[PDB]
Structures are given as C-alpha cells and as structure tokens.
Design a protein around this ligand. Structure first.
Ligand SMILES: [Cl-]
Lengths: 365, 365, 365, 365, 365
C-alpha cells in the first residue's frame, strides 16, 4: 500500500500536481516500458516515411494516415474504461474488507472465556490462534505474498500457527478441497468444551462467540469467492481490445505528414507526438488502474500488506487475551466527575480556530 | 468458471495483452461465428459493387453508403451498453453470492447438537443433509448443469440426497409450487426434536440454528427470485436493437468506394475493413459480455461450477459434523506462550521486502 | 413476468437476436402505436413538401430542415435516459424484494409453536394467516391486480383471509390511515398469548417470532414507501421532454429534400426514414423501459405475479405449519454414513464434462 | 409529495406524455421565471441587433455570435449533471428512509409490556410517546414544515408530546447540543423500570426493546447527519457554473443573424429560439431536479409530508398499544382448515387473466 | 463543515445561483491561485505573439495553435472526472458514518448497568469514558485537527480522557502497532466485572453491551482502513494528468490569432479568454471537488468538525449515564389518554396548508 493520505490533507495550490512528482506506486512505473514501445514504433514509422519510402509509396502512406485518424474514436472507450474500472475498484475495496481480522473475536474472547489459571490462558490463546490459523490458511491460497512466506504447511507449523499434533489431525483429514475452514470447526469445539466446563459462564456468551466466528469465517469464505471468480475474461478482453485498437489508429493516424503536400490538418511537424503521448498516458494509464487492482494480493508496492496484517493480528490478539485479561486499573473518579459540563481543553493551534457556532439544526436561525 | 487470477498477480509489460492470447472462456469463442457472418456480408456487398452492378447503379450505391455512414452513431450505444452491462454484472455477482453454502450451518451444528453415540451422529448428519437437499432442489430448478445431473427426483434419491422414505413423504405433499423449501421445514422439526430430547443443551443454541437456517433458505429463495425475474425483456431488446442497427450502418456505411470517383473520405481501399472489424469486436463483444452473464448456471466454460460446489458442500459438511465432532488435539502451550511479542518469521523471499515502516496513522510523521 | 431465462442459458450464434422475434412482453407491443404516429407525421410532412407547397415555400421548408437537423443532439439524451432508467430499475428490483413473503415466518412457527391437539394447529395456522392477511392488505393498496381481486374488505372475508368476527374488530378500529399493520399487532398478541400458555416453550423462541415478524412488517412498510414516493415528477418530465424534443428535430430534420437542389448531405431519397425509425426504436424504446417498470404491480405481461404469490404463500404456509408439523421420517443412516468421502454420482451428460481440476486457490500452480 | 403512481400503472400510448400536462409538482412551476428571464434577455439582445446597433457594430456582433456558438459544449455538462443528480437522488431516498417511524417499536411494546390495569396502559403509552417525542424533536430541527408547527418547546408541551413536568426535567438538563436524544434515554429508563417491576416478563423481551429503540434512535441520528452534512458546496457551485455558463454561450451563440450576410448555418430566422428554449427546459430543468431534492423537508408540493407522518405515527402507536393490547378475536377454524389446498377465489376481472402456467424453474420445459 | 442546508430549503428563482455568491467553503477559494496562474500564462503567451515574435515566428506560432486546439478533447475527461469524483464522494460519505459515536453505547449503559451508589456511577462513567478514549485515539491518528489538539498521550491524560494510572498500563503494553483498540479491551473487562458483581442484572443485558461495543470498535477500525488505504495513487495521477494536459491544449489552442491572417474560426479577439476561463472553473473546479474530499479530517472550512463531535460525545454520554440514570418524571396520563383519536394541533402557518387528502394507497381512487 502506497499511502499518500498525509500529502493531501490540505487542498493547496499544488494540490494534486505534487503527486505527479511521486515515483513509488505511480503510473510512470507501470507505463514507461509500454510508453517507449509506443514511441519507438512511432519513430520507426516516421523515419520510414522520411527516408526509405519512395514518392509513390509516400502518397499511399498519406491516405492510410487520414484513414486511421478518422477511426481514432477516443469518446467510446472512455465509457468502457470507466464502467469496467469502477467494477474493478468495487471488487478491490470489497477484497480489502474481507481481510481476516480478529479484533471482534478477541473482544468477545477476553470478556467471556474465564480463568486466571494455566487452563484459562490456554483456552483463550488457542481460541485466538485457531482464528489466526484459518487466516493464514486463506491468505496463503489467495496471496502470493503470504504464500511465499508459507510455501508449505511445515512453514505454518514452524511459524507456530499450527502445532505438530494439530498437523497430524490436519493432514489425516480426508478432503480434496481447500481446508482453511478446518480451524473454524476446531474453534467451535473448543468453545463448546469451555461452555461445558464452565469457563464460559453463560449461554448468551456462548452464542456470541459462535456469532462472531461465523462473521470471521464468512470473511475468509469471501476471499475465496473473489480469488475463484475474477472479473469475467470476456469483459477484460473487450476492454483491452478497445484500448489497444485505439492506439493502432494513433500509431498511424497521428504521423507527421510532408508539409509540401498541403494536407488539411496535416501541415505541422513537432517530430514528437506530444499530445498523443499524453493521451497514451491517459488511456493506457486508465487501463493500468484496473490491471493493478485486479489482483491486489501480490508483492507490488500499492498491494495490500497482508503479511504485516497477519503479524499485527497475532500480536494484538495474544496481548488482548493473555496480558490484558482482567488487568484493569482501579475505578477512579474522573476529572469531570463533579462538573456540570465535561469540557476538555484545546491547544493554542486549535483554540483560535474552533470558536465557531454550534450546529443545532437548520431550522434555528 | 475460467480463473485467470494467477495470470495478473503482477502488473508487468504484457499486463492485459497476454489475456488476448487466451481461448477458453474468451471473446473469440463467443464472436467468431458472427464475425465471419459480418465479414461475409461485407465481402459480398463489396464484390457486387465491383462486378455485377452497372455504372448507373454504382452511383446510386455510392450515395447510399454516405447516407448510412452519417447514422453510424457509435457514441450513444456506448451508454446503453455500459449501463445495461453494469446491470447484468450486478445481478450476476449477486446470483453467485446466493449459492446455497452450508459452512455457516455446519459450524453451528457441530457446536450445538451433541452426542458421540449413534443417535448423536445421525442428528447432525441428517441436519446437514437436509440443508444440502434443499440446495440440490433449488439448483436443479435454476441450473441446467445441475438439472442434467438430477433430471428426476429418483436421481436425487439415488444420489443419497433423499431417502426412499423421505421421498414418500415428499411426493405425497399436496402442492403445485416448487417444493425446495420442504427440507427446511424438515430441518426445523429435527432441531425442535433435539432441543426437546436435550441433544441441544441450550435455548440460545436452538435459536442460533433457526437463525442460520433462515439465512440459508433466503439464499435459496434469492436464487428463485433471479431465475423468475430476469433482466426485463424490453431493455434486452432495446440494447440488442441499437447494437445491430449500428452494424447495419457499418455494413453499408464502411464500403470501399471507387477511388476514380473522388469522394471525400472515401478514396482509400484496404479490401478488408480492419477498423470496422475491430469496432465489431468492441460492440458485439461488449454485448456478448451480457449474453454470457445473463444465465450463469449453464454448462459453458465461464459459468459457475454448481455441481462441484454441491460435492464440496456435502463432503465438508459430513466431515465437519461426523469425523470432526469433539475431536480436538490436546491443549498445548503455543510457541509464543512465554514471549513478549509473538512474531512469526519470514522466508528469504519475504524478509528482504518487508522491512518497511509500520503504519501508525497519517498524523504521525 | 415474462420469463426468458431458459432462452439465454447458452450464448450461441442467435444469442440476443432471437429475443427480437418475441412478442409478449416486448418493445414492439409497447411502441407500435407511437411508431405509426411518428411515421404518419413524417409521411404527411413529406407529402406536403412534394405536392401542396409552392416553389417559394419549399425553399423556406428546406432551410427549416437543416436548422432542426443541427439540434438533433442524440448524445446528451443518452445520459439523462441511462441515469434515469438505472434509477427506475433500482427501485423496481427493490420493489420486488419487499414482496411480503412468509417463508421465514413459517419456519419459525413450525419450530416454536407446539402442540398436536386442536389448539396447537389453530395457534400455528392463525399466526400464518395473520401474516398473509397483512400481505393481502398491503398488496390491495399498491397493486391494481390484487385490488381488482379484493375490491372490498368483504372480498377479503369471502377469501377467508379475514373472519367475520375479525372484520368487526377491524372496522371498529378508529383510524383514518391505512390499517394493513393491524394483523401484525394481532400477530404479536397471539404470540404473547402462546408464550404465556406455554405453547412457545422458550423465551428465545418468543424473541425469534417477534424478530421475524418485524422483518415481514418492514417489507410491507417498504411497499407503502415506494407506492407513496415514486420517481420525482420533475425528473420524469425532464426526461420525457428531452426525448420528445429530440424527435421533433428528427420529424423535420430528417425530411428527404429535393435532389435537384444540390443540398449538402440532403441529396438521397429512401422515401422511408429507415435509420430514423430505428433510432426511434432506440430512444422511445429506452424510455419505455422506464414507463413499464415505474409501476410494476399492474396487469400487464411483464408485471410481477402478485396474485400467484399470494396463493403460493397461503398454500405453502398452511402446509408447512399444519401437515408438516412434527411429521418427520425416521432417522436412518445415510448412503455415505460408512464412507470416507461422500461422493454422489454424475449422469452421462455430466460425467464427461466435469473431470476438471479442483480449484485450491490461485497460489497453487 | 406529488403522487402520480396511479397515472402510470399501465404503459399505454400516452405513457409519459400525459405527465407533461401536470402542473402541481412539475418542472414548469420550477422553471417559468428563469424561462422568461432567459427569453427576455434573448429578445432584448436580438432587438438591439435589429434597430439600435450600426452596420459596423453588427459585423462585430456577428463574429461574437459565432465565437460563443463554438463553446456551447452541451455534451460535457450532461455528465456533471447526471453524476451530481444521481448523488442528490441517492441522499434524498436515504433521507426518506431515516424518517422516525414507530411501527417496529409498537409491535414490540404491545407484545412485551404487560398489564390491563391503569399502570399497564401508562407504561405502554408513555413508551410510545417517548419515541414520538424524539421524532418531533428531530423533525423540528431538520424540517421547516415541522418547525413552523412547533416553533417552541411550549408548542410541543401544548401538542401533548411533552408533559409540563417532563419539560422541567428537559430544560434543566445542562447541554449546549441538540437534545433530541433525551427521550430515548427516558425510554431506556422506563423499560428498565418495567423489567424490574415484572411488567416485562422476560429478559429476552427486554433486550428486544433496547434493540429496536437504538434502531429508532439511529434513524433520528441519521437525519441529523444529512441536515449537517449536505452535498458539498464546491460540487454544487461547480455544477451550477457549468449550466449557467452553457446558457451564456446560448444567449449569444444562438442569436438570429441577418440573412443578407450569407453566414454558414446562420441564414434562417425563427424570431423565437424554439430548440434553445427546449434545451433550456432540459438543462435548467435537469439541474432543478437537484435543487428540489437537496432539501426535501420544506413546504413545497413534492416535499415529504413530515407533519402527516407525525400524526399517523402518534395515532397508530396509541391505538396499537392501548385499544389493541390483548384484544384478540376468538381462535376459530379457518375456511381452509379441512382443505387439501387452501385456494382463495378470483374475481371475474382476474379469473380470465390468471390461468397462466405456474413457474417451477427455468429447467423444467 | 460548511452548512448551506437552510439556504436551499425552497426552490425559488435564485435557486442555486445564490450559492455562487458564497465565499467560505467555495470553489473560488480553492481555485483563484491556479486561475491567475492560468491567465498569467495566457497573457504572457499572447503578449509574446504581439510584440516579441517576428513575422516568421508568428506564422509558426499560428500552426501550433491550430494543432493544440484539435487535441482539446473536453468530452473524454468528463468521464474520468465523474467516475473518479463519484468514487471519492462515496469514500467520503462513508468516512463520515464511521465517526466514533457513543449514542448507541450510552443508551445500553444507562439501561443495564445499575446502582445509585458511588460504585454504580463509576461503572457507568468509566464505561462511557473508555469508548470515548478509543475515539480520541483513533481520531488523533487520522485527523490532523484532532492531532493538533492531542499531540501527545500526556495531552490525552491532561484532557482527562486517560488517567495517569491507565497511562502506566497503556504505555507498558508491548506492541508496535497503533493501540486505539486498547480501551475496547478495557471496556470488555469492565463489563465482565459488573456482570460478575451483579451490577448488570442479566445475561442478555451483558450480550447487548458486547454487541454494541464491537459496532463501535468496527467504526474505529473502519477509520483506520480509510486512512491507510486511500484512493489508489495511479488513478489519482491518471485523472490529474488528463485535466492538466487538457489545459495545456487550451493554453496554446485558445490563443487569439492575428485577424489580418484570415484563419478559420480564429478571426475574433476578446483579449481575455472568457469561455476558456469558465471551462477552467469547470474542469479544475470539478477536480478540486475530489482534492477537498480526499482527506476530510483536516482544518479547512468544509472538513468534518471532529473536535466538536468529541466534546458533544463526552458531554452527552456523561449526562445520559450520570444525571439521567433513573431520573424519570412520574407516570402521568397523557393529554389523549381518554381520546378516540390522538390529534395534535397545527399552527396558523401550517393549518391552511395541510388540509390535503390522506394517502391510502394508489389503488383507492
Ligand atoms: Cl439474541
């Protein structure tokens, strides 16, 4: 993920123009190889028209250039690109929200599974580790970044996500399908055991764990839906054909013709097609937005940081259910306990800006 | 389903252009018959203008060609196609999410229905089989792929989805409407029995089963909504009329006229309409995106694998509620039980890439 | 509802072109009266220019035709139509999903209200009849198809939806507003009675009934929201003005002028405006998509089958809570009870097509 | 609200053209003042060119007219208007759904708060009155229609929404923010009291009241979100600048030039710009769709009937929880109690239309 | 936030034109520096063509101007801007709804945590303060307005959001990730303590607190998702390149050429490009809509008032759970207790407008 949120906090004079100076996660990185190949074909096709062609063939070349320039219909592609890109951005934001996060699970686990003894801590840690084990097992199937970190199940055991004994019970399961769902069934059996043993003091507390685990498992099942069912291949090929056929019309249709011929609209030579190379940055770059977001789980710079999230989830969920289990500060009276209004102060950079009138509704003038 | 997710994990130089080399699930498979019929009508209409017509009729043919070329309004159709296609892709992704999956049901069933004896395993397996029976019964009504596998109810009994005794109770039900809902009522009676017999130890556990069964049944009821109510026929006919009337204007409006006539914009012969056949790949291919997704339950290559899902659901749901019922590994201390931070390692292909600074928020520079 | 789902299960050579041969629920049925009035005004305006006008008035008529042809701006309307139509299709699919269905209610009622005696069957049937009574009472207010079947409340009593005694309690309620909500309050009093009498054995079972009844009532309340608040009238008048003002520009701007005048672009006579009548099928037909879906509850062929749904709901909900109450087949061992994998067979038309490799994720090459 | 739902139930020959005859809630009411000002500036600018200008100044005026006619780019604005209008219609439909309705609350209150005595009726009525008090207090802040009915809190006490004693407790609350949330806290204290006193017989019944009250309060909190955060002002000013700068190009760019000058495209005089005034109805009317829906809570004809809803909610919620508390008709056997199929009849206008085949799925030919 | 909701309550003659007179939160504030730089480059490029260039170089300059005017393709950018802006407005409205609000939490806390003694008030106030502590801790990471008010954790302790003892337990937590989640774990331990001590009298009351806390925490977790994952940088650079390359074509392509040259479309001088500067207000202003909403948490005038919300939330949540705990007015009979219809009156400005017929449905003529 390339975060530039702090760069556009204000809307100043260099608002969005300053981000064109950025290289990491940018369009120039994604386009410069196709950009030199587009210009290299243009300069070769121009240099042929200046030296190697004859006077008969040049007049034939001139009529071909005016033919292709008519079929450079840039208007239509700007709809197929926009609808398709919006479809790709919609699946990409929804792939991010289906990332297996255990924050909802850990707040239930610390509040409902009980016990300061060695069995109380083991119930809670194993419950959070089973959630995180499924999260590794769904991310190693959809993320090549996660998969290069856990290429085998032995790596998952080495990482401590699975124990050697659990792997014996894992690999002796007879199923030909992906078994990321297996620690979720292990989760429901550990929660059913602790309810029977009274570590879960309540039946409603037990229902909450199974409610929030299925939310977790449906997020893992949603990442399998996106990985299996991509944007349909025909709609990807239809969008790519229209963009690349528009730049075949520009490769011929924008060639600089001989001024001594007196052609309409064709009498000026820039020797470099500046506005065609800028239109190339537009349309090939607009399509490269979809090529970058269609598989957001790789190793490139703007991709999701799945491995960092896995570390953040295992660290926080152990910390919350072991070190933070029933470790509260003593109940003290707050600083506005005996106050009419509870009003926290402002700093000197925020006092002189926030004397504004409080909104009460639009009918109170 | 044609999965090409692994082909676009990186955004390299051959980003989307490599998918134009793909044949299975592609646009060339969907279009090549209409493409040769479009070119065959163009070559016949051109060859008439070169040999069989007279000099009087050719001048009449020339004015007809410039007439039709004015009415080739490609701009407008690129809106009717985009809005209609987005409408078809929206119904198609939502048809996929309404697929009857039993993963939420099996995690509740293994955690709440109890008993290692022969009656405990029968309660749980019959509960998951009733869910899967409705799933076969809704998919044989909407999927010709599923229906060719289960053409009769005898096939469903042969497949073991229904028992002979249940079919007696099934076929003696007096109803003229589709009875896919029937094992869901059978489900609520089996769950009410096991709550009365104490296999379901809790009232909140009983409510969770009925909560998650109605989620399952509403997904089956959603697949009946899409099968009954398609994209409206008038809006399908309006989109198809505009695309096919645009290519009647191209069939005449793009004919290669006699250069010795000196017509404006009509003096060059390619003998094959290259940019009109590429525009045909655009607009007939953009419409063929909607024709492929309007009924995603058939046997074609990019359709949903409904039969594979039925096998995956019956196998996993038996495995989870029979072999995995109360079969836990022993509670062991984890590898980070006595660690301050729980930090799993990286492989050598992921260590040198993930030394990046951790995000703390955009206000912490 | 005109269902053509089975016609487009494959994407073959006659993909969408075969639906242009369809008459019921089609665009030709919705347009042919306006189409002959458009052509009849064109043929009258042409025949005036050929016989009744003089040579002075024809030259004045010619300049008016080139004036209107400039203002035939077909591009802009293709946005106002697409956004407005998408807005109408969005409300129309959401009007369908708010149809009062009792499937969620009947699965709770058979699982929670108990008793094989005469009082047990009466509790359950009256609970499902009160849900269906509200459903008739909301559909007779929004559907002229349902209203022509139940023009009075006497018809609802005759249909058995309301008893004569309930109508006494119904019509003596002092309220000036629509009372479709009244059997929902009758529902919550019947469920509160059976919980007090112990027919509902559980407090969590009681909460589930009131949870799923408010879902039902909110769907009935959603159909009152759409019936009261249509697409806003100004946005309907703005879209209709733009389409009809475009075809006033075509009625004059596409007239066939005298070839002996030598006008640019105006020298060819087809005597029938083929591409203008096809553009009329486009734009008047695209607007007729919205006119057909703006009130989907009538009697026309593509409208929702509300009356059929009412019969389907009353039949299934009586069958589920009376004949299917606690009528289970005996718990038998299934055909894969002693199997490692539970694998149902394929037919001969599905065996040779589904030997495909199972998807495990996109990172497992 | 101007309801025209009954006018478009069929799609007949005068489908949408009949709504152009409508005046109340229409575009002609919203535009006719700006329309005469547009035409009055056009007729003044034309009459200057015919009489007061000289022959030198007219030739200067002619070149200015052809300059502005080039910059009348109607295409681009039709995107800024469509996206912005769709954004305004999306917020407007969601402002309607956040209207404080008590139907979900009253069905829970009649089913869970108990008691036929004077204290039982007071618990239930005060619970529904506290919900309705917040609904008045949120609507008087966002609706000038509601605010002109309740300009002070004394008016709310006079209306009986608040008692004099509650207003003492209301106005002695020390808070500078809008206190519409205050009867919702009063609600949770009344429900907690009746659970302690046993009027609420169940803990699950108590949780349902607090569940459905927060749904009610979040709808009131959503109406404060829309009232505070409108469509952003810069995006409103960008859309308005583009529409009004297009009609400055039409005010000059469509002037009728002297025919004796022989200008291209400028030789015909209609003395009234018919197609420019129709384009004005298009673009100023399309923008007036957003100006009418951006604040839907006023007193104009197509605005929401908030005051009528407040009366409908207070009347129905008293009727349901006082007159309809435990007032059921006796449990009778229904008319299809001893029937195999329960089939209600059709009237003569619905019998001959609904002999259609029942849908069983698209795979059953 | 610049609220102009009260200015557009009616749709009068100065409907949206009056908002072009507004300065605070407007487009003129966001654009006037780029607008003078665009005009300053235009006036310098014009003044070079009038004085410093020679007659040879001016003829070369003239052909460059007609070259760039062809590539001023304003149509295509109006799609890339609309789709991208709609994407930015969609994330911006969803960033607002994820603001940490404690209204749902405080209604549960006052209804479920019990006790008038000093320990009862401390349980409730500390529960609402822990929710508000996370809300400060998530807003200081994403809002530079909130962060300038709380630059350190000492400021949070000084503000009374954290106690000195809690900060000891806060800063000794071993985690490298942002710890805004920490008082949510503190919340679940305080609620689990009060359930064990019987201040929470019910198990269902305990489940409701943990249900509504995870809703609160997921809103805080959603604000971290938007802050980390912005609009992708390539799609921001593609939109900015297209807008700025269009105005490089206008900077040259709209220059006023010498009239004595007789160029087509280039013979008129306004000495100020009025319609190009208005198109600049359109396209640079349409892009400045996205630059203002892409980071809505700053200090600019139309940004969200996060600091005001923090004060509003801490004040209301203390008031509701301390001063308003079990402080009800006595149960009185209401003003319509003995009335058939409960009908509140109208004022004189609302009586003469609301005699309209009550809607009963669209089928009741
Ligand atoms: Cl619950």
């Amino acid at each position: 993920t390339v975060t530039y949120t702090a760069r556009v906090a204000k809307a100043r004079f260099g608002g969005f123009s300053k981000l064109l100076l950025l290289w990491r996660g940018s369009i120039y990185k994604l386009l410069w190889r196709e950009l030199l190949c587009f210009l290299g074909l243009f300069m070769a096709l121009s240099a042929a028209y200046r030296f190697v062609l004859t006077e008969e063939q040049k007049r034939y070349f001139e009529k071909l250039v005016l033919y292709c320039d008519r079929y450079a219909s840039l208007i239509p592609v700007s709809f197929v690109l926009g609808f398709y890109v919006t479809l790709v951005v919609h699946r990409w934001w929804n792939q991010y929200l289906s990332m297996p996060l255990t924050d909802a699970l850990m707040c239930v686990v610390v509040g409902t599974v009980h016990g300061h003894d060695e069995r109380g801590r083991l119930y809670r840690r194993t419950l959070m580790r089973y959630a995180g084990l499924s999260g590794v097992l769904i991310l190693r199937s959809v993320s090549t970044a996660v998969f290069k970190r856990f290429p085998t199940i032995d790596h998952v055991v080495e990482a401590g996500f699975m124990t050697r004994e659990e792997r014996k019970k894992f690999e002796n399961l007879n199923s030909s399908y992906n078994k990321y769902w297996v620690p979720c069934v292990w989760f429901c059996n550990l929660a059913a055991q602790a309810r029977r043993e009274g570590r879960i003091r309540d039946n409603g507390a037990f229902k909450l764990l199974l409610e929030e685990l299925n939310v977790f498992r449906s997020k893992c099942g949603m990442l399998f839906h996106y990985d299996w069912i991509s944007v349909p291949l025909v709609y990807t090929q239809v969008v790519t054909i229209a963009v690349y056929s528009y730049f075949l019309a520009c490769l011929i249709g924008r060639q600089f013709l001989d001024p001594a011929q007196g052609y309409k609209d064709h009498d000026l030579d820039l020797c470099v097609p500046i506005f065609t190379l800028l239109q190339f940055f537009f349309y090939a770059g607009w399509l490269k937005v979809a090529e970058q977001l269609i598989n957001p789980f790789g190793e490139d710079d703007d991709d999701f940081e799945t491995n960092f999230l896995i570390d953040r989830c295992f660290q926080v969920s152990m910390l919350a259910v072991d070190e933070m289990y029933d470790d509260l500060a003593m109940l003290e009276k707050d600083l506005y306990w005996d106050a009419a209004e509870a009003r926290a102060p402002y700093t000197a950079a925020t006092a002189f800006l926030m004397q504004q009138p409080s909104f009460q509704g639009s009918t109170f003038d």
